[PDB]
Amino acid sequence: MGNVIDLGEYGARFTEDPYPVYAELRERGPVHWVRTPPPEAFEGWLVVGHEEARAALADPRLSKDGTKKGLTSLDVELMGPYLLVVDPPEHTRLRSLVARAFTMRRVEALRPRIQEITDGLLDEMLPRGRADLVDSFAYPLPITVICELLGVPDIDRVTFRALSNEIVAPTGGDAELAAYERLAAYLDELIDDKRSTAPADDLLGDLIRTRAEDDDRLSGEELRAMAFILLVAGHETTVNLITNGVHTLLTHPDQLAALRADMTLLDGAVEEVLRFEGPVETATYRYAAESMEIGGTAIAEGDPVMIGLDAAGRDPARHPDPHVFDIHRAPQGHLAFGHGIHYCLGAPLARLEARVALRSLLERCPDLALDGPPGARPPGMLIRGVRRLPVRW
Amino acid sequence: MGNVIDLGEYGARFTEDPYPVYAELRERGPVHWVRTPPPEAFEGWLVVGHEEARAALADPRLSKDGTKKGLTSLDVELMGPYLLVVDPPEHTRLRSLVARAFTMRRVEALRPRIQEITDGLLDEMLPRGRADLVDSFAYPLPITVICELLGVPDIDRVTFRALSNEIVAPTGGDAELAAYERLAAYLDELIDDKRSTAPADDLLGDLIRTRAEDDDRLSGEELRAMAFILLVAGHETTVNLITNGVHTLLTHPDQLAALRADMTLLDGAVEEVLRFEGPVETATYRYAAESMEIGGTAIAEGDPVMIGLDAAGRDPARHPDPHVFDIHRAPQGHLAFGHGIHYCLGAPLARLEARVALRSLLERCPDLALDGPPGARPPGMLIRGVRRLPVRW
């Protein structure tokens, strides 16, 4: 317990642009005690260096499961135990039930369908000459893809969106509480309706049959929490990827022109976007399961640790000229998806969605431009991006 | 125990060029029960898929501590417990002793010296007009860099090399163990020469003080074995990266000419070598501590797992047109340094050692060329490289 820097006190220059602070801090060291901005201005360690971001993602002394300390956060209570709030051996078991669904091989078999979705959205959007890229394009593609994968297409997406939006960028203690208890219910309703059809040849179908079987493979509260995460992690991350993409592209016409000149560079741009504006700014819940250290810095048992994945993406030791967006940038290991046991299950899917989305849009909009200012940034440290992206072509 | 892909049945073809075989296996699936080529032909699961390689490296069910199942290899007993034969918490305790020395900040401080060393090696070497690159350049640089770092002042480099070479590629039973004891003699005596000397501020200094202040933080057995791993891992890998690098460039003249023409590309180029001819072909000892699955293949408890890193580097689904060497390659996440708790401690160092070496040399030898046939490949699944590389300039 000592000198805290309150990130609130940087105002909203820091929400809009966290990097010159991240940098300032990274020069002073790799790890520092921090109160995050309001609302729900949380405190604990922030990791801002790559090498330490990487290594703390792998450190077996960091836990994600607070019930081992007697604490029991909301999402745990109302959703259940899910992938990001458990450690091995339960992590392993729950993970094994869904890994085969999300391999490169299987994800590639969705290409034609993701392409077809993208074509219909651009068809629908193009003729009106201008729009919110999010409502019109970048939201519906992932939320349609993930609902089809599960599969549950007649879902109320708008209720879903708003609940999902709240739980990843909480506006306050009550709203948060409300949305969690509202989504728990919605999910309970959803699962039952899926149980009430029979021949569900799909991951949630498979998942409901697994729970019903009297192995501890999958509990009822785990089944709810699985679908919570599959649906939510699919959604805001990928919307933001696609949107941060186009946004940074159009704020860097050098590179965009470079890219249209040679569309083989496309995938290398996506990787630069993921480095430079990675949709997950700050990694999810971790605390010290024992006394340990990260820099020279002693972290005591109990302290939370927050790994700055976007902070690491602009480490100059790892990424020379970190504040420059270069497609032709030298192979450039980032941490946008994590590392270690909880490395993103959706990475191949995300990469596919985002690549197909961005190619098709750029092919079908030679004159795409901003028009003009982008919408509100959600609150909290989890998500990096904007809710509305007004665009024209 | 079931079907065995005997890797020996392929002959010297495989040892020379394993990639077409890896590709044939990977096309069937990503994991296979194998028999390593002779000598001391060994059985286990070889992982040949990128996605499965990453997961396996992070999987908490694989152990590297054979003692936990009543089995002691020549390295463990004779050298001691060191970083690649322990799991957490022993691993966590040992790695803490040394992480601070191998950081990016600290490594970069060595750039003047590594350069100075690279130049001394080239000034001496360049007038003779031709040389074995290994004896004259690639070997001495890493063995010098690491020795200073420790710092073991004057080293018998001709003896150490032979010992080290043998334990990293064993030729037979009698030679292997002999090398371990002959090497276990030298380290002990290297350790005591340091013990019997004026205390100064370097890693071995700090290590030996820790041994003396024993609260099980560092046992003398572990002290030998730490000095073992750092000297040995420091040397084979880096020599082989420098060598693999020069040789791949000279067998691919367009790409070299592209690099000669634009030396900013060097770094991408180096990362492409690591992907294409990674010095560590197959990662070190791992076994299943409980029964598991890897690509939907059932792994019994006790089965060895061999994670094929170079195999992963030619995986079509992670790297398109994998058997093309492309200085301009894009998104290209490889696994040449591992992943998870045991990720290379020395990667920023290796990258630095290699980059200096390749630049200085390429800048001072504009008509560098092969002359003619390269040396023999050592045996075993650990090292991918040749042991004598004759060049001219």
Ligand code: HEM
């Ligand atoms: C589009 C960009 C995406 C990014 C940047 C991203 C990023 C991440 C990150 C950083 C984590 C780990 C965070 C931590 O360790 O605390 C993660 C985990 C996860 N992601 Fe994603 N993700 C993306 C897309 C997806 C998609 C499409 C899905 C599902 C369809 C998904 C499902 C998950 C799941 C289930 C986890 C938890 C894994 C575990 O604990 O074992 N992600 N993602």
Ligand code: HEM
């Ligand atoms: C030149 C290229 C290098 C490559 C490709 C390389 C590769 C690797 C790989 C793949 C591992 C993990 C193997 C496994 O999980 O079984 C590893 C571990 C290690 N490497 Fe390297 N390495 C290199 C250079 C170095 C250097 C220069 C040093 C020391 C100065 C070093 C020290 C280590 C150590 C100490 C470990 C063990 C880490 C642990 O168990 O926690 N390496 N390296």
Ligand SMILES: CCCCCCCCCCCC(=O)O
């Ligand atoms: C500061 C907000 C943290 C809230 C933790 C719960 C979020 C669950 C959704 C995770 C999505 C993802 O990991 O990509």
Ligand SMILES: CCCCCCCCCCCC(=O)O
């Ligand atoms: C199964 C392989 C075990 C080999 C034991 C020898 C250890 C040599 C250390 C080199 C480690 C590395 O560079 O990855």
